[PDB]
Amino acid sequence: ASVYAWNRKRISNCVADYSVLYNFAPFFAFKCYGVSPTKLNDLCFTNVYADSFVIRGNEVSQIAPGQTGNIADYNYKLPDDFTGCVIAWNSNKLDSKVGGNYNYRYRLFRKSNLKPFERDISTEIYQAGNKPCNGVAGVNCYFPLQSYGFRPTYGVGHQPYRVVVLSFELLHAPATVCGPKKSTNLVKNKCVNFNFNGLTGTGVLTESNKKFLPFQQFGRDIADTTDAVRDPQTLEILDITPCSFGGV
Amino acid sequence: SALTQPASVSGSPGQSITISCTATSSDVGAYQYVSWYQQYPGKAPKLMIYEVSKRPSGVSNRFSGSKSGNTASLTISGLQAEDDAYYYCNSYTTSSVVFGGGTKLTVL
Amino acid sequence: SALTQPASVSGSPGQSITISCTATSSDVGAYQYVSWYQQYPGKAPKLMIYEVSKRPSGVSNRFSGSKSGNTASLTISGLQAEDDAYYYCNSYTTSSVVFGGGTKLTVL
Amino acid sequence: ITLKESGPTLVKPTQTLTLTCTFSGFSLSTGGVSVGWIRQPPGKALEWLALIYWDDDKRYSPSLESRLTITKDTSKNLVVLTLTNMDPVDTATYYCAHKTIPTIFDYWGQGTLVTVSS
Amino acid sequence: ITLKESGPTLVKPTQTLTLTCTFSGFSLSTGGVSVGWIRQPPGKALEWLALIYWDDDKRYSPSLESRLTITKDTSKNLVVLTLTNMDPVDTATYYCAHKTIPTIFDYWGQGTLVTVSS
């Protein structure tokens, strides 16, 4: 989509792996605020928003906290308390036609600044100080939108760039987007430290003979002693006995 | 010597323009109060903005200041022919209030 | 007029030779994409190299391009008798794809 | 990727010439991919004719535009070029090559020699 | 808020120049409010002169201090600036503006042109 028509989206309720990015592309512009890219896959978030669009070459720097310009001040501006990051990879093999591709536009003229994450589509004809030249030409009768017009002769500064901005939330978050992905082969009949879906303990595991009802996950004997557990992978019931101990 | 402003700027009518007021002097303090004045052709200067991004009620909604460190980027959006004028910046240093060297903005 | 190519060349078999196809015309743009085509004796031209210092997988390892400014020096090392053919260059200008005047290579 | 041209081999002066280029291996739906036409007089250099992008944005040669209405059909992957008012300059070979943005004309067809005379 | 300056418009070398700035809408008794002086050579930038706070703690410009004793009178809400030893440099416009701590000199007056020459 265009700069003034970014594609807002929400991505929640998923085991989110931020390492599918690195096999994609050279990642010309990749810098993260508030969280390191290396330590992303582990952390959890409230709501992850993604905005996708395309801009020119020498304006990729303008998508930053507190930076003023013409694409930042007129049609897309993100706050100073932004947490997240931006990912831009130069793309002029799929966006530039020979002669100028008048398909991508950008509001070039307007009246004032916009509030954070304020997207507008109105395409009225700009004023002329006095009662303007509505739908005609004259002194300063400039349509507000302007096409990019890419061609394969533009310098690297004028080439099209695809860019996605991810806005995270980290304060008090109800983990909805984060991945663990870490399991180990099961060991039986040996004193083993186990962590079954959060239940942590020690003991010897033995094949079970008791019928768990299908909605049950844990088993208890008298006095709340956890006696059995069902595997979250193979759904087998397992018996727990504390390994041998005593006084000498 | 105390502050520093560019000579002049000329922006086409209907565009935006920013002016810089570099301090170019060590220890002007925290550089937090910076007022801007509009000098007419032989008239009393009028306060445009004070307290950088804040603005006194009574003036337009296009001027907006900023600070990239040691300067004040005074911004002017929607340039109108009325904006042809002089502009000055003003902010105390440790011992005393200082002014800018002046800037001229002519719209053509 | 748009590009410029030499009439023909005849290089002894087994040596190297570079050819230039200068534009000799202002504002062809950045002059960044420059492709070379192999014209057989009455066959459809086949792409040999594009993006001058680059080369498409599928061809030999003797051809290597360079750019001495406003032209593209297509090089051919270890000339073999199989190489007798025509060569053309191609790069868009501001309004439309343009070609070179053509070159003939006969190996003797 | 493969291309093949077809059409009338003979045409008379001031006639409407038609050519059909059928390809296989790719389509006109993915981004960047386009298909263009090229001509070559006997013993002379090549020249452009038209281009059909994948989004159905079309381009013609400046000097010879206002002609050669190039159409297409994405179901059977076929392109059609039609240029009327045949002149003896247009007696040349004709190729339909698929164009990408950097690798200009990387897949050419065979090409058919066509004559304009009595 | 309103201000008005007054005094002699013409003055000779080595003479005592006096100026009285009368204001309306505010006084010099409330906290934060103060009144300062500024000069501007013809076609040049402004400059500071002195300042008289509401608590009667007065301040002068470092470069041009030890003169132009700034007095005041809270009964008629009037400020008086007096600078002796006229030089040909002192021919410039003069303003008396109201100062708050953050909104420095937000209310300027009219200004009266005064000349120092024979």
Residue numbers in the entry:
A (entry chain A): 348 to 595
B (entry chain I), C (entry chain O): 2 to 109
D (entry chain N), E (entry chain H): 2 to 119
Paper passage:
Elite nAbs, mainly derived from the IGHV2–5 and IGHV3-66/53 germlines, showed potent neutralizing activity across Wuhan-Hu-1, Delta, Omicron sublineages BA.1 and BA.2 at picomolar NT50 values. In this study, we used single-cell sequencing technology to isolate hundreds of monoclonal antibodies from convalescent patients of BA.1 breakthrough infection and identified dozens of elite antibodies with NT50 values at the picomolar level. To further analyze the molecular basis for these elite nAbs, we determined the structure of Fab in complex with Omicron BA.4/5 S-trimers by cryo-EM combined with X-ray crystallography. Next, we evaluated the epitopes of these elite antibodies and found that these antibodies mainly fall into two distinct groups, which was consistent with the results of the epitope competition assay.
The BA.4/5 S-trimers adopt various conformations when bound with antibodies: TH003- or TH236-Fab-bound S-trimer complexes adopt the “1-up and 2-down RBDs” conformation, while only two TH003 Fabs can be built due to structural hindrance from the neighboring RBD. TH027 and TH272 Fab-bound S-trimer complexes adopt the “2-up and 1-down” conformation, and TH132 and TH281 Fab-bound S-trimer complexes adopt the “3-up” RBD conformation. Group 1 is represented by TH003, TH027, TH236, and TH272. These antibodies, which are similar to the IGHV2–5 germline-derived LY-CoV140415 and XGv26526, target the conserved solvent-exposed outer face of the SARS-CoV-2 RBD without directly blocking the binding of ACE2 and can be categorized into the RBD-5 community. TH272 tightly binds to BA.4/5 S by hydrophobic interactions and hydrogen bonds, with a buried surface area (BSA) of over 700 Å2. L441, S443, V445, P499, T500, and Y501 of the RBD form strong hydrophobic interactions with G33, L52, W55, and I102 of the heavy chain and V29, G30, Y93, and T94 of the light chain. Extensive hydrogen bonds are formed by Y54, D56, D58, and R60 of the heavy chain and A31, Q33, Y34, and T95 of the light chain, and D56/D58 of HCDR2 form a salt bridge with K444 of the SARS-CoV-2 RBD. TH027 and TH272 belong to the RBD-5 community derived from the IGHV2–5 germline, which engages the SARS-CoV-2 RBD at a neighboring site near the RBM. In contrast to previous work, the HCDR3 of these antibodies harbors a conserved HxTxxT motif, but not the classic HxIxxI27 motif previously reported; consequently, the whole HCDR3 loop does not play a critical role in the antigen-antibody interaction network. TH027 and TH272 do not directly block the binding of the RBM but can tightly bind with both the up and down RBDs. However, TH027 and TH272 were significantly escaped by BQ.1.1 and XBB variants, likely due to the K444T mutation in BQ.1.1 and CH.1.1, which disrupts the salt bridge within the interface.
